Write a sequence for this structure.
């Protein structure tokens, strides 16, 4: 895929928000490192229960696939949501 | 009754 969103993940360990490349494809969602450009973690679209599209932060609810959800800071939150729903529209 | 119309999008391929 080429559709990647620049998001910032707030994890513990440091107060610095980590720049992440949120790869939204017609088949999966991959977390690519912004500087290393490597894929850390990838999810299937079929594991999407819901998502929260806010103008400052975006949250992906993978349900019972892992502990908690995936929340990242980005102004492209709705763009992400729209794109996921777009790819999902192709499968759905 | 707690709605989540805006912000929360309910997808239907969560198997």
């Amino acid at each position: 895929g080429v559709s990647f969103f620049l998001v910032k993940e707030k994890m513990k360990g440091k107060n610095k928000l980590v720049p992440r490349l949120l790869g939204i494809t017609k088949e999966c969602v991959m977390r690519v490192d912004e500087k290393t450009k490597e894929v850390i973690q990838e999810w299937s679209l079929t594991n999407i229960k819901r998502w929260a599209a806010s103008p400052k932060s975006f949250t992906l609810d993978f349900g019972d696939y892992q502990d908690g959800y995936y929340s990242v800071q980005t102004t492209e939150g709705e763009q992400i949501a729209q794109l996921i729903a777009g790819y999902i529209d192709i499968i759905l | 009754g707690r709605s989540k119309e805006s912000g929360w999008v309910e997808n239907e391929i969560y198997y």
Q: What stands out?
A: Chain B is about 0% helix and 20% strand. The interface with chain A takes residues 7-15 of chain B (CB under 8 Å). The beta strands of chain B are 8-10.
